Amino acid sequence: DLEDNWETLNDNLKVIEKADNAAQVKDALTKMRAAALDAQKATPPKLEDKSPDSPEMKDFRHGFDILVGQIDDALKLANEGKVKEAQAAAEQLKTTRNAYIQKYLILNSSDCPKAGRHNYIFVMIPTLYSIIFVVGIFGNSLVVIVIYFYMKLKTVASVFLLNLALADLCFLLTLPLWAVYTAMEYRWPFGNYLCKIASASVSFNLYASVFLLTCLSIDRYLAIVHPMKSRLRRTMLVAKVTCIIIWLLAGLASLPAIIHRNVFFIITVCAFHYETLPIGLGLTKNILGFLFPFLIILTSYTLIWKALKKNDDIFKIIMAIVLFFFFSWIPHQIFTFLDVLIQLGIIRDCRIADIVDTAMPITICIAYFNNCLNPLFYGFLGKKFKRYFLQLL
Numbered sequence: 344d345l346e347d348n349w350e351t352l353n354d355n356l357k358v359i360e361k362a363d364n365a366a367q368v369k370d371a372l373t374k375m376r377a378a379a380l381d382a383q384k385a386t387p388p389k390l391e392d393k394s395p396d397s398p399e400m401k402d403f404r405h406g407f408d409i410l411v412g413q414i415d416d417a418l419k420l421a422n423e424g425k426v427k428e429a430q431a432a433a434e435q436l437k438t439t440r441n442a443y444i445q446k447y448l449i450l451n452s453s454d455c456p457k458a459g460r461h462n463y464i465f466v467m468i469p470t471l472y473s474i475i476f477v478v479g480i481f482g483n484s485l486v487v488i489v490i491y492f493y494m495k496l497k498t499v500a501s502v503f504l505l506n507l508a509l510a511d512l513c514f515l516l517t518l519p520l521w522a523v524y525t526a527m528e529y530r531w532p533f534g535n536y537l538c539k540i541a542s543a544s545v546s547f548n549l550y551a552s553v554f555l556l557t558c559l560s561i562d563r564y565l566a567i568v569h570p571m572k573s574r575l576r577r578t579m580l581v582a583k584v585t586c587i588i589i590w591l592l593a594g595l596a597s598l599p600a601i602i603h604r605n606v607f608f609i610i611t612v613c614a615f616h617y618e619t620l621p622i623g624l625g626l627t628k629n630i631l632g633f634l635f636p637f638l639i640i641l642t643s644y645t646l647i648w649k650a651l652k653k654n655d656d657i658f659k660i661i662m663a664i665v666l667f668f669f670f671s672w673i674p675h676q677i678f679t680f681l682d683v684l685i686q687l688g689i690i691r692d693c694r695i696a697d698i699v700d701t702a703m704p705i706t707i708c709i710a711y712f713n714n715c716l717n718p719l720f721y722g723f724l725g726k727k728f729k730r731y732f733l734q735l736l
């Protein structure tokens with residue numbers, strides 16, 4: 344970690360600034376020397392897709408070579424006995440330190456700064472996120488118990504309904520991180536590792552859900568419209584493998600968040616770094632993660648609802664999770680496209696930019712509100728579940 348070695352340099356400089364003898368300066372500069380050596384092996388936050396041979400990365404590596412040199416002169420002075428002089432040469436780290444934050448950490452976008460930074464958002468969103476997390480954690484963990492004991496994982500539908508609980512449960516585990524981020528007025532105090540994992544976990548939830556909701560739709564279509572000899576041993580085998588592949592595809596689809604997300608200054612923010620290219624990539628996610636599956640899902644359900652309006656309790660559950668999921672993503676879908684128009688230069692108006700940046704935290708809340716609401720859609724099984732509960736004990 345570059346951020347870790349960067350803290351190793353700043354804290355060891357404070358040791359040198361208060362050091363009395365040369366032995367205190369020697370041991371501090373030795374730790375700093377090894378720190379800048381493996382930090383040279385690393386890649387800065389703004390050069391995520393730059394070959395370790397490009398003039399950009401070479402300028403990064405050369406930067407720490409000068410830093411090693413400044414430390415090497417200070418070590419030479421400490422070995423001679425000069426403490427007051429070794430401390431002066433160590434203070435040259437602050438130049439390289441301020442040169443690194445201005446080159447790779449300051450991401451000044453300006454144009455419409457402090458947009459969507461209203462007093463009610465920093466209070467409304469963390470209070471709403473507290474509820475989604477707490478309600479959803481107890482909700483989905485009860486769903487996992489119900490699937491293992493009431494459903495006993497005997498159907499194909501049961502397997503996908505369990506995986507959706509785990510996927511929803513995973514996203515929920517990262518929710519208090521995004522709650523305090525908003526409460527601290529978009530200040531990220533968890534570093535670079537959690538900025539990447541917490542952003543990839545939000546991305547992963549969308550893809551895995553969309554993939555599971557497609558699988559459950561096809562399952563409902565084939566169960567109701569085209570029934571065939573149920574070879575459970577083979578159907579359970581294919582359903583178990585399909586879910587592994589889903590977690591793999593959603594993992595691979597959320598890889599950009601692990602690559603281009605970093606912590607940057609303006610107050611630190613956990614944001615995506617843009618290299619023309621996002622236009623031809625933002626069009627690829629819509630035609631795969633919303634237009635293509637919702638097309639497959641609707642075709643399955645238009646055929647199944649028609650053949651059932653005159654397994655069904657499960658269909659009600661799968662239909663309610665599918666209908667709510669897509670009607671909650673529409674607000675965010677409109678404003679995400681509108682945010683793209685701000686980032687390009689089509690709509691260059693801070694009055695409009697504010698309306699979009701004040702609504703996006705509210706729209707991303709509703710588009711992820713299903714993780715706490717999905718367990719509540721199991722109420723269709725309530726009359727049959729109380730029948731099992733009483734018969735048990």
Ligand SMILES: CCc1cc2c(c(CC)n1)CCC(=O)N2Cc1ccc(-c2ccccc2-c2nnn[nH]2)cc1
Nearest residue numbers: 468521525542543545546549599600615704707708711
């Ligand atoms: C709902 C919790 C959540 C998140 C959040 C903020 C908030 C508080 C309003 N709450 C602040 C804004 C922000 O960037 N975040 C993180 C985020 C991470 C991933 C995605 C995402 C979703 C689908 C597909 C791709 C991505 C993606 N990958 N990399 N960058 N975006 C969107 C937002």
